[PDB]
Amino acid sequence: ADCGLRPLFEKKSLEDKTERELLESY
Amino acid sequence: GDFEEIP
Amino acid sequence: IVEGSDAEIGMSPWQVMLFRKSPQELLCGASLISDRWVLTAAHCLLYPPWDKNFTENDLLVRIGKHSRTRYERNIEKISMLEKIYIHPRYNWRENLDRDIALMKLKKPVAFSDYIHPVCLPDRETAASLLQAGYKGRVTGWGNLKEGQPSVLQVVNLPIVERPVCKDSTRIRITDNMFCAGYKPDEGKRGDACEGDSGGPFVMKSPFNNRWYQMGIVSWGEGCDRDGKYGFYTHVFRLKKWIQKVIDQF
Ligand SMILES: *[B]([O])([O])[C]([C][C][C][C][N])[N]C(=O)[C]1[C][C][C]N1C(=O)[C]([C]C1=[C][C]=[C][C]=[C]1)[N]C([C])=O
C-alpha cells in the first residue's frame, strides 16, 4: 500500500548514506 | 540483562 | 552483524525486536509487514535440538527501535502476540528449510516516522532483484563478532550464485533459501550473526523506489568467515503460505 516507502527517507526524498551502493549493483 | 526495564 | 555500521534513524522502520519476558533478552530480529503481522524465522521460536520452543505468552515484540537495550520511551511500541504460525513444513530436522513464521499482534500498531511496513515481493520484483551481484540489506542487533552493539547495525551484501552457495557448506541447500556475502577475493565483508536471525534481507526496487523483503536471516556457519556465506529464507518462494495464513486468519 504505502509499504517500503520510509517516512524519513523516501517520503521526504532523502537518501540514506549507503542506499546508492545497492541501486548501483542493480 | 544489559536491558533497560520495560514498563 | 559483523563488519556493519550503525543504522541511521528511520533507516529500517520495519525492523522488529523479538524479546522474551523472563529472562528479559533479545531473541531475534523480525519485520513488520502490516499493522498486525510480523515475519521472522521459525528457528527463533521453535528449535527442538536446543530445547527452544516459544509460545506467544513468552514473547514481546518491539517496533520502532534504535537502541538495543534502551526503552525508547516515546518512539517504540511493544506488542503482545495473539498467535504464532510456523510453516507446517519448516525442517528444523535437517537444514532449516522453510525457516519462516508469522506472528499475529494482539492489536494493530500505529505507523510513524520509525515504524513503517516493508513490502513483500511479487513475482516480477523477485525475478528482477534476486540476482547474483545485486546487493541487499541486512539489519540487526546481533553479535558483532563470531560484541553487542548499542545501536541497530546495517550491512549491504551481494547475492551469491547458487553453485557457490552449495559448494561452501556440507548442508543441503534448497530453493527456499539463498546465500549472500562477499567472496574472499572481493575485499569487503560482513554478515549476520547470533541474534540477527529472523531479521530482514531487503532490496530497494529501482522501478518504484520501494523496499521489499527478499529474505530472512536463517543460518550460516560462523560469522564472516572466509569462503562461507549467509543463508536467508527466500520470501517470494513462501509467499503463498504467507498469503494463505493472512487471508485465513
Ligand atoms: B539466529 O540468530 O538464531 C542465527 C543467525 C545466523 C548467524 C550466522 N551467520 N541462526 C542460527 O543459529 C541457525 C539456527 C540453528 C542453527 N543455526 C546455524 O546457523 C548453524 C548451522 C545450521 C544450519 C542449518 C541447520 C542446522 C544448523 N550454525 C552454527 C555455527 O552452529
Domain segments of chain C as ranges: 1-12+118-236, 13-117+237-248
C-alpha cell at C67: 537502541
CATH-assigned architecture of domain A1-26: Irregular (4.10)
Residue of chain B whose alpha carbon sits nearest to that of C61? B6
Residue in C71, C79, C141, C144 to test binding to B, most B beta-carbons within 10 Å: C71
Q: CA C203, CA C11: separation in Å to the nearest integer?
A: 13
Q: In chain C, at which residue ranges do the beta strands (DSSP E only) sit?
A: 5-6, 15-20, 25-32, 37-40, 46-47, 52-53, 59-63, 77-86, 101-105, 135-140, 153-158, 177-180, 200-204, 211-219, 230-234
Residue located nearest, by CA, to atom 18 of ligand 1: C219
Q: List, in sequence order, every residue forming a beta bridge with C85; answer none if it has no partner.
A: C102
Of the candidate CATH numbers 2.40.10.10, 1.10.8.350, 3.40.50.150, 3.40.640.10, the domain formed by C1-12+118-236 belongs to: 2.40.10.10
Give the position of cell 572481493.
Answer: C186
Q: Up-side HSE of residue C83: CA atoms within 13 Å toward CB? A: 5
DSSP C99-117: --EEEEESSPPPP-SS--P
Q: C79 with C104: CB under 8 angstroms?
A: no
Mutate to test the pocket of ligand 1, among C219, C223, C229, C231 (most ligand atoms within 8 A of CB): C219
- What letter represents residue C108's amino acid? P
Method for this entry: X-ray
Of the candidate CATH numbers 3.40.50.261, 3.40.50.970, 2.40.10.10, 3.90.550.10, the domain formed by C13-117+237-248 belongs to: 2.40.10.10
Q: C-alpha distances in angstroms, A23 versus C60, C133, C158, C211?
A: 35, 11, 12, 11
Tell me, letter by letter, the H, E, C secondary structure of C147-166.
CCCCECEEEEEEECCHHHHH
Contact A3 C210 (CB under 8 A): yes
